Amino acid sequence: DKASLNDDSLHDLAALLNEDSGIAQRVIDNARISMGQDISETDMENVCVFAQRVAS
Amino acid sequence: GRLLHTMKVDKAKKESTLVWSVIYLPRTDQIASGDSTGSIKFWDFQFATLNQSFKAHDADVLCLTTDTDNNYVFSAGVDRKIFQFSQNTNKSQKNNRWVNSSNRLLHGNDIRAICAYQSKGADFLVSGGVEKTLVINSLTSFSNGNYRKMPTVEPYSKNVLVNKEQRLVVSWSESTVKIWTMGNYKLVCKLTLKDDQNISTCSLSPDGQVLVVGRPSTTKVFHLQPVGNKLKVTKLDNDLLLRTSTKLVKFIDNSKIVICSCEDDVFIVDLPQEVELLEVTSTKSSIKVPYINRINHLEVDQNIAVISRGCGVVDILDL
Amino acid sequence: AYVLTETSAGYALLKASDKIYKSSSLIQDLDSSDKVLKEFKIAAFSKFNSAANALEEANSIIEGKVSSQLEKLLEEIKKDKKSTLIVSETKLANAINKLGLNFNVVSDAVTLDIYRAIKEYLPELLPGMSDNDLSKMSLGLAHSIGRHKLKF
Amino acid sequence: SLAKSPASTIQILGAEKALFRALKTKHDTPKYGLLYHASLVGQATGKNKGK
Amino acid sequence: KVVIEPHRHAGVYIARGKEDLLVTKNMAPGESVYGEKRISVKVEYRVWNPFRSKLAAGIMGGLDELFIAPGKKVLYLGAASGTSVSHVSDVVGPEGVVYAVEFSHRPGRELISMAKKRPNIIPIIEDARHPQKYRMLIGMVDCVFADVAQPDQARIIALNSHMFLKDQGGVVISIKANCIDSTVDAETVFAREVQKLREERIKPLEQLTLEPYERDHCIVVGRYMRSG
Amino acid sequence: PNPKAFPLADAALTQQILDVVQQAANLRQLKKGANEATKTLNRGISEFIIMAADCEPIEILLHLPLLCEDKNVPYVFVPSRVALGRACGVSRPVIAASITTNDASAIKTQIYAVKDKIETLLI
Amino acid sequence: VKQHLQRETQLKQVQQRMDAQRELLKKGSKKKIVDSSGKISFKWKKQRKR
Amino acid sequence: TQDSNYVRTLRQIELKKLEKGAKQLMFKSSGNHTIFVDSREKMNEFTPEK
RNA sequence: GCGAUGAUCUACCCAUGGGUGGGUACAAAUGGCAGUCUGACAAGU
């Protein structure tokens, strides 16, 4: 969810695509100020399943 | 925010009746009503219904009043009649009926309101109407008590003055200042004071040709000159008298005047000269009634002045 | 003297070297300026905790009663037995008087101009107290408060 | 919106096409629309399915 | 093909194309909030319906000192269903902010969605007459609009303007004569409410009868000096 | 008694309503039941709306005042559904009803007087 | 727009008169009265349909 | 009944297509505009142009 | 330093720069067409 993101997650995204581009900082700031309404847990898990599906 | 009870009064055919007054009787849980059919109705509040229905007199009741015990209720009509309705006697309160006990007329023109007070000190109801007088009557013995008729005119706040110099008189009503010289009697002037909109509360002229009018909002000053059978007037000006309030006005001479203002502030001018005063302590009644500790009367000698305030308090001022 | 004020940035109390005459003098002097901010800078600010839920319940139980950070501040606000305080609500004034400090505080009197002026000047207390633009914080907080007032 | 609508609509809500064709040429209206597959109708039989 | 033109106030535009219409410049483009139409020319735009937004009728009726500006902070009492508040957000733009207020619910949720789409919105979902539950969240509005049918229009404006309207501030109110009196002439009611505000520290600068658009409403505009 | 319907009449205004609706249905210028009132409101023929504040649950007509607010049509509640039924002239409880438009009625004056009353209350 | 609205009112009238005819057909104890300006109308006897 | 359905459907067509046409169309504002003045001299010297 | 393994051949402006017009394949949308059935009897005895 848009909350459980720390600077450890920042470095994790750096291990992922890129933090040198600053996108990790961008998303962490936007999540800190995040305005999208937070939603049901079960929606987070099934949508994660969906993301795994599209990735595979 | 709900209306949950509705009753209708018996109707008149050639007209559109209207219930002029209502009132609540708390001893026995009723409400009483006086209605332009010329009727007095006693409704019991619970169950919202009718116990008593009297045709009181010809025309529309206007006011109702009660004693504390709800043993006497007095109706004040427009056809000049006061009715006393009774319940004090034992079987009467035991069955909660009422009685058209007495009626009586004393007013001259007609009645507009009635309000009753009772206490060990005194026990009276007060009727006030169109004939510019108030009548005070005995609540306990209305069929027996003797009235009192306190009359129209009360000169406590005078609205006229006279100047023996050139032997004339000046009267004022709402923005109207009529003067007459005597010799027969002939009018002189007329001052609809176009500017102000209140009743003129204090106007005065000295020995001579000066004049002042005063209202607690603004005040104004004039000089008169005799042009013969008529006079002419001119509107003198001072911002101080324009701005300051005036309870009371007096003349020292034809140039010096003194002014008492509702904040109990006194000024002197020679045509901002202020003079001190002595304070007053406050009691419980002084807290309650605000105006009693305000200056009540101002008088002046050739020089000296005297001030009287509601505590019976009297003081001397040397300008 | 002291004045309380409640912000999405936290909880700010300002010292006022004495009130009512102060209210007059300030308004006829038109003290809506940062110069007046220096004249009365601050007594003690308390930053909140960055728990949106904590701030939500803070607002809820402020519209109700006194809140946790508020007692954790009033425990230390006092310097003497009685220290005059300026509040913006009748109900919170009564609650503060009825809690366990038992010091002097005047209610939401004619000091609307003063609360208004400190509200206007706290943008200049952003460099002093809240070193950031709290408009976004107010945005998120208001969103959350509306959602929670509704069942949502 | 869905509660905003009245009953007859929620009956007819699917086959709006045939509904409008019938309306604009004076044939007789359809009856089921989308609520066909409701299990209740799924055990009903004919005119009974309509009712 | 379509012609844009600016109005006496900033942000208001008229399109002269095959038609002439009232329009604002979307920060959020291509997302028509309440089924209103739109137009592009490139950049985006969003139309007003005066028949649905009282303030729009005033714009067409002509008002000189309508203090709502792009770079401005504006409070919005009677924000219901989000339409006109979305419009005023769009006209103040990103730098401007609109402090919307509602106390019904269903328009509350609609406004919640509208805030969910726009940042310049800031919704308040509280009592009209109890301005504390938002004193603690609102600060230094410079311009206030109110369209409310609670006949204490003068109160609610006086309160929230003393608490919020910075000095020499701008105030504008919509009045429904049929709501407050419905027996005596709307001219009389308008005048009466005028001296009402006059006593309540509004200098009344102007009022528009919303005649050919809505029945029996007046928009009153004034300023707010040496007040608090 | 239900805290959900906001405008609820008294005995007097209830009497006035139920009379006007008797003569309306006696002419058959009245449409009955919540669904049909909903239809009419969307038709824009609904002169105005009576509801029954004693239907369990109340939501099943609570929805309509949404439409009423939108289309600027008067709506009132009366507190007895069996009353509204035996008034409008059927054999069942009738939670709602709406009076239609026809200028050729012999009841225009009554219908506007009543809708004046309901406007007075609602506003 | 003008002919929209006038066609609209014309169709409203047509529909109103035609539903009057339907009601004429349905059921009850009707009564035909010639109202003073010379216009027909129908009134139903006071009767609760079962 | 089928004739009623047909007519009412046409009436709905025309009605809401009217409302669309209006919503895109625009009227002209004819409303009163009374100006506030704090002095009778300014009243007399008033000119909307200035 | 040619070719049957294939030569040649299938809208308007501002002088190999920009602006206009049309024609096919793909996507977009709260564009359109385009409008949400009727309204008291029925079944058993």
Swiss-Prot record, chain A:
Top-level division of the source organism's lineage: Eukaryota
Subcellular locations according to the entry: Nucleus, Nucleolus
Signal sequence segment: none
UniProt family annotation: Belongs to the NOP5/NOP56 family.
Free-text function comment from the UniProt entry: Required for 60S ribosomal subunit synthesis.
Other remarks in the entry: Present with 13500 molecules/cell in log phase SD medium.
Assembly mode: Interacts with NOP1 and NOP58. Component of the ribosomal small subunit (SSU) processome composed of at least 40 protein subunits and snoRNA U3.
This protein's name: Nucleolar protein 56
Source organism of this protein record: Saccharomyces cerevisiae (strain ATCC 204508 / S288c) (Baker's yeast)
Gene label: NOP56
Swiss-Prot record, chain B:
Source species, domain of life: Eukaryota
GO CC annotation: 90S preribosome; nucleolus; nucleoplasm; small-subunit processome; t-UTP complex
WD repeat spans: 8-44, 49-86, 188-223
Organism: Saccharomyces cerevisiae (strain ATCC 204508 / S288c)
Gene giving rise to this polypeptide: UTP4
Record-given protein name: U3 small nucleolar RNA-associated protein 4
GO biological process: maturation of SSU-rRNA; maturation of SSU-rRNA from tricistronic rRNA transcript (SSU-rRNA, 5.8S rRNA, LSU-rRNA); positive regulation of transcription by RNA polymerase I
Keywords carried by this UniProt record: Nucleus, Repeat, Ribonucleoprotein, Ribosome biogenesis, rRNA processing, Transcription, WD repeat
Main location: nucleus
Function of the molecule: Involved in nucleolar processing of pre-18S ribosomal RNA. Required for optimal pre-ribosomal RNA transcription by RNA polymerase I together with a subset of U3 proteins required for transcription (t-UTPs).
Note: Present with 5440 molecules/cell in log phase SD medium.
Subunit and interaction comment: Interacts with snoRNA U3. Interacts with MPP10. Component of the ribosomal small subunit (SSU) processome composed of at least 40 protein subunits and snoRNA U3. In the absence of snoRNA3, forms a complex with other t-UTPs. This complex can associate with pre-18S ribosomal RNAs.
Compartments it resides in: Nucleus, Nucleolus
Swiss-Prot record, chain C:
Localisation per UniProt entry: Nucleus, Nucleolus
Domain of life: Eukaryota
Additional note from the record: Present with 34700 molecules/cell in log phase SD medium.
Biological role: Required for pre-18S rRNA processing. May bind microtubules.
Protein family according to the UniProt entry: Belongs to the NOP5/NOP56 family.
Subunit structure: Interacts with SIK1/NOP56 and NOP1. Interacts with the trimethylguanosine synthase TGS1. Component of the ribosomal small subunit (SSU) processome composed of at least 40 protein subunits and snoRNA U3.
Stated name of the protein: Nucleolar protein 58
Species in which this protein is naturally found: Saccharomyces cerevisiae (strain ATCC 204508 / S288c)
Designated gene of the protein: NOP58
Covered range of the whole protein: 2 to 154 of 511
UniProtKB/Swiss-Prot annotation, chain H:
Compartment(s) of residence: Nucleus, Nucleolus
Family statement drawn from the similarity comment of this UniProt entry: Belongs to the UTP11 family.
Quaternary structure and partners: Component of the ribosomal small subunit (SSU) processome composed of at least 40 protein subunits and snoRNA U3. Interacts with snoRNA U3. Interacts with EBP2, FAF1, MPP10, RPS16A and RRP14.
Physiological role: Involved in nucleolar processing of pre-18S ribosomal RNA.
Protein name in UniProt: U3 small nucleolar RNA-associated protein 11
Lineage: Eukaryota, Fungi, Dikarya, Ascomycota, Saccharomycotina
Full protein stretch here: 101 to 150 of 250
